C-alpha cells in the first residue's frame, strides 16, 4: 500500500459520450479496447480542477454486473494518481443508484461514478456502463458530459497507480501512500445499505411498517429485485429491520449476469413475480430494475398498478408518509407522455403540476428550486426530492405506508381512486427498429397536419363517443430554472374530454405512441383497458397513417 504514480501513453477513442445516463458499451468493447475504460475515467477526473482534488471525495459503486469490480479497481488506481483525496465505495463494489445519490448528498462529495447500465443485460456477453453524477447527487448535466466527451476525444495520456489494489470486501478505511506525494489517498468501504436505510428510516414510519409486515395478520408481500442491486436493500430493510418473512425477498442475491435475464420491471420481464402474485396468496408485489431506480407495483392476484396511476395514488395519500407531513408538498410533476392521472389529484388538492419533457434534469431543476416533492414517469419511474435520482424501493415503502393507513387492498385503493378522480386508461405502444425514413416522414406529415388552422375543433368518432381536438402541437418546454428551451418533444393531440394521443421518436428508430383515455362514468372505469383504449388507438393510427408509413400492423410491445 506504498505505491508509485506512472504516466501511461494512450490513444483516444472517438465515441465516448457520457449521455444522460452514462457511457454504455458491450462488456467486450471495454475488454478488447486498450485503455477504453482508463481513458474515460481520466476524462471524468480531468474535469475536476487540480486545486480542488485533494479535498474532494468521489462516491463509487454499481449494480453488481460483470466487469464492475475490475472497473472500480481502475477508478481507484486512476483517482489516486490524479490527486483525488478520497473514494467512498460500497462493500463488494455494490451501491444502488439511489444509494449513490443519498451518500453524495450526505457526505457532500463532489460527485460519484456509478457502474451500471441500468436495466440492460449484464454478463460476459452483456453491456457495461459508466455513469457520472455531480455534487447535488444527480446525473451530470450536458455541459459537464460535453466537456468529458471533448477531453476523451483528444486524450494522449493518463495518470495511474498500477500497483494500487483496494480490498472491496472489508469495511473501513484503507490508506495508500503515494511515492513522492505528501498526502495519502484514502478509500472508505461502507456497508452498501446503511446510509440509504438510515435515510429511509427518517422518511418513513418504520414502527408502523414493522406492525404492518410482522406477525400472523401481516400484509403478505413478494419483492423481486430481479437478481440486481436492490437485493441486499430488500433483505436488510424489509426483512431484517421491518420483519417481513425471509421469503418476501425474491431474487435478492445480486448476480453478475442478473440470472441471465433482463432486469426490467414490467409484466413480461418480471413474469415470474406476476405468476406468483396470480395465486391470490399475497397482498402486494413489486419489482425493481437492475440499478434500483425503477419499480413496478402489483396487488393481489397480480392486479397491475399502472405507473401513471401509481404516482397519482401516492400524491392522493401523500401525508401517509412522515417526510411529507414535515416538508409539506412543494409541487407535483410528470413527464409529458405520462397519463394525466396525477393532474386530477393536483387540481383537486390545489398543488402545482409541472409537465416536463422526457428526462431527469427537468425534475432535478424543480427540486433544487424547492418546487417539487413528488414526480412520476409512465416508464415505471417514481421519485421525490429526498435525493436526485428516481428510487424504486422508496416507492414501495410509500405504497406500504399508504396500505397501512388505508387498511384496504391495492385493487380497492385504485377502484376508490378511479371513482373519486375519474380513470385515465393508459397504454404505450412501442414500434421498435422501424426504418428511419418512414418514421421521420410519419412525424413530419402528422405535425404539418396538426399545425393547420382547422385542425383544432376537428371531430373523430369512436364507435359511439365523439372526440374533439382541443389543442395539437409539438411539445415545447421553457425551463423556469435554467432558462433553456426544449423543443420538438412530442406530438400532442389533446381532446376536449381530457384524453390525449402522444407520438414520440425515441432518442433503427423507435416510435412511442402513448394513449391516455379519460373516463368518469361508473359503468366504464372498471372495464378492460385495451378495450376502452381501442377507439383512440384507432384514431391515432388513422391520423398518423403509421401502418402506411412504417409497414407495421402491430406494435412491438404494449405496456
Ligand atoms: Ca434504472
Swiss-Prot record:
Question: Where are residues bearing Phosphothreonine located in the sequence?
Answer: 116, 186, 468
List the PROSITE patterns.
Answer: PGM_PMM
The Gene Ontology biological process annotation of the record reads: carbohydrate metabolic process; galactose catabolic process via UDP-galactose, Leloir pathway; gluconeogenesis; glucose metabolic process; glycolytic process
Record-listed Phosphotyrosine modification sites: 354
Q: Which residues carry this modification: Phosphoserine?
A: 118, 135, 202, 207, 214, 370, 379, 478, 486, 506, 538
Q: What result is annotated for mutating residue 421 to H?
A: In allele PGM1*1-, allele PGM1*2-, allele PGM1*3- and allele PGM1*7-; phosphoglucomutase activity is similar to wild-type
- Stated consequence of mutating residue 122 to R: In CDG1T; there is 7% enzyme residual phosphoglucomutase activity
Q: Which InterPro entries match?
A: A-D-PHexomutase_a/b/a-I, A-D-PHexomutase_a/b/a-I/II/III, A-D-PHexomutase_a/b/a-II, A-D-PHexomutase_a/b/a-III, A-D-PHexomutase_C_sf, A-D-PHexomutase_CS, Alpha-D-phosphohexomutase_SF, PGM
So which cofactors does this thing need? Mg(2+)
Q: Which residues are Mg(2+)-binding?
A: 118, 289, 291, 293
User: What does the sequence similarity comment in the record state about its family?
Assistant: Belongs to the phosphohexose mutase family.
Q: Which PANTHER family match?
A: PHOSPHOGLUCOMUTASE-1, PHOSPHOHEXOMUTASE FAMILY MEMBER
Q: How does it assemble?
A: Monomer.
Spell out the protein name for this chain. Answer: Phosphoglucomutase-1
Name of the coding gene: PGM1
Amino acid at each position: 500500500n506504498m505505491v508509485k504514480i506512472v504516466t501511461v501513453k494512450t490513444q483516444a477513442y472517438q465515441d465516448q459520450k457520457p449521455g444522460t445516463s452514462g457511457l454504455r458499451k458491450r462488456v467486450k468493447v471495454f475488454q478488447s479496447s486498450a485503455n477504453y475504460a482508463e481513458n474515460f475515467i481520466q476524462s471524468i477526473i480531468s474535469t475536476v480542477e487540480p486545486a480542488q482534488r485533494q479535498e474532494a471525495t468521489l462516491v463509487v459503486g454499481g449494480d453488481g454486473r460483470f466487469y464492475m469490480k475490475e472497473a472500480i479497481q481502475l477508478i481507484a488506481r486512476i483517482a489516486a494518481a490524479n490527486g483525488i483525496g478520497r473514494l467512498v465505495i460500497g462493500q463488494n463494489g455494490i451501491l444502488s443508484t439511489p444509494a449513490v445519490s443519498c451518500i453524495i448528498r450526505k457526505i457532500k462529495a463532489i460527485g460519484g461514478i456509478i457502474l451500471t447500465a441500468s436495466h440492460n443485460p449484464g454478463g460476459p456477453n452483456g453491456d457495461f456502463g459508466i455513469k457520472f453524477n455531480i455534487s447535488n447527487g444527480g446525473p451530470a448535466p450536458e455541459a459537464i458530459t460535453d466537456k468529458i466527451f471533448q477531453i476523451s476525444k483528444t486524450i494522449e495520456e493518463y495518470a495511474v497507480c498500477p500497483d494500487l489494489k483496494v480490498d472491496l470486501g472489508v469495511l473501513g478505511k484503507q490508506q495508500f501512500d503515494l511515492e513522492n506525494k505528501f498526502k495519502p489517498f484514502t478509500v472508505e468501504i461502507v456497508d452498501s445499505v446503511e446510509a440509504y436505510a438510515t435515510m429511509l428510516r427518517s422518511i418513513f414510519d418504520f414502527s408502523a411498517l414493522k406492525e404492518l409486515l410482522s406477525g400472523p395478520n401481516r400484509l403478505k408481500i413478494r419483492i423481486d429485485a430481479m437478481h440486481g442491486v436492490v437485493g441486499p436493500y430488500v433483505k436488510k430493510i424489509l426483512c431484517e429491520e421491518l420483519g417481513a418473512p425471509a421469503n418476501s425477498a425474491v431474487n435478492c442475491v445480486p448476480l453478475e449476469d442478473f440470472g441471465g435475464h433482463h432486469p426490467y420491471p414490467n409484466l413480461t420481464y418480471a413474469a415470474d413475480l406476476v405468476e406468483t402474485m396470480k395465486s391470490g396468496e399475497h397482498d402486494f408485489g413489486a419489482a425493481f430494475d437492475g440499478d434500483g431506480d425503477r419499480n413496478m407495483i402489483l396487488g393481489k392476484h397480480g392486479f397491475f398498478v399502472n405507473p401513471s396511476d401509481s404516482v397519482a395514488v401516492i400524491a392522493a395519500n401523500i401525508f401517509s408518509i412522515p417526510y411529507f407531513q414535515q416538508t409539506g408538498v412543494r409541487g407535483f410533476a410528470r413527464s409529458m407522455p405520462t397519463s394525466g392521472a396525477l393532474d386530477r389529484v393536483a387540481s383537486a388538492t390545489k398543488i402545482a403540476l409541472y409537465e416536463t419533457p422526457t428526462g431527469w434534469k427537468f425534475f432535478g431543476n424543480l427540486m433544487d428550486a424547492s418546487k417539487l416533492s413528488l414526480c412520476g414517469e409512465e416508464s415505471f419511474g417514481t421519485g421525490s426530492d429526498h435525493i436526485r435520482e428516481k428510487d424504486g424501493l422508496w416507492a414501495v415503502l410509500a405504497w406500504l405506508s399508504i396500505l397501512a393507513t388505508r387498511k384496504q387492498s391495492v385493487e380497492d385503493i385504485l377502484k376508490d381512486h378511479w371513482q373519486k378522480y375519474g380513470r385515465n386508461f393508459f397504454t404505450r405502444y412501442d414500434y421498435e427498429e422501424v426504418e428511419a425514413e418512414g418514421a421521420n416522414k410519419m412525424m413530419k406529415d402528422l405535425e404539418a397536419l396538426m399545425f393547420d388552422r382547422s385542425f383544432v375543433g376537428k371531430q373523430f368518432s369512436a364507435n359511439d363517443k365523439v372526440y374533439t381536438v382541443e389543442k395539437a402541437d409539438n411539445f415545447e418546454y421553457s425551463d423556469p430554472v435554467d432558462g433553456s428551451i426544449s423543443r420538438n418533444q412530442g406530438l400532442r393531440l389533446i381532446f376536449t374530454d381530457g384524453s390525449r394521443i402522444v407520438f414520440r421518436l425515441s432518442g433503427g428508430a423507435t416510435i412511442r405512441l402513448y394513449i391516455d383515455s379519460y373516463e368518469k362514468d361508473v359503468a366504464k372505469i372498471n372495464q378492460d383497458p385495451q378495450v376502452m383504449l381501442a377507439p383512440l388507438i384507432s384514431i391515432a393510427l388513422k391520423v398518423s397513417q403509421l401502418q402506411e408509413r412504417t409497414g407495421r400492423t402491430a406494435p412491438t410491445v404494449i405496456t
